[PDB]
């Protein structure tokens, strides 16, 4: 498994060699591989040239965002709530959290 952070900087103008070798390893190698590019430059596909993009399997996946106000409210509830029993305070602590969270005027 390949883990690539900031694969856009490898996608420079001049050489692009290292991308070209791993993407051809998809095509021919008996060793099963998988490549994982992580970046933040959105239109990553135009940054590549022609001969590398044809090696590429073209499948990108966009990462989601918090699209509604209710979503992160649901997230912070799952974030702060403890579910496993450790402390005597826990059952008291869990209902204090949501009571602040359920009230929209809190």
């Amino acid at each position: 498994v390949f883990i690539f952070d900031e694969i856009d900087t490898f996608a420079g103008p001049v050489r692009q060699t290292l991308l070209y070798n791993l993407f051809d390893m998809v095509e021919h190698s008996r060793v099963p591989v998988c490549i994982f590019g992580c970046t933040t430059k959105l239109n990553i596909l135009e940054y590549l040239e022609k001969r590398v993009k044809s090696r590429f399997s073209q499948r990108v996946i966009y990462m989601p965002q918090i699209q509604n106000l209710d979503d992160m409210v649901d997230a912070v509830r799952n974030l702060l709530t403890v579910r496993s029993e450790i402390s005597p305070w826990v059952s008291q602590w869990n209902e204090t959290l949501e009571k602040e969270l359920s009230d929209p005027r809190s």
Binding site: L42, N43, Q58, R59, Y62, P64, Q65, I66, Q67
Partner: peptide, 16 residues
């Protein structure tokens, strides 16, 4: 179509 269609439009309306 999955080769074509973008998300920067959907990214912008899901921004801050």
């Amino acid at each position: 179509n999955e080769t074509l269609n973008s998300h920067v439009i959907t990214f912008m309306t899901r921004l801050s």
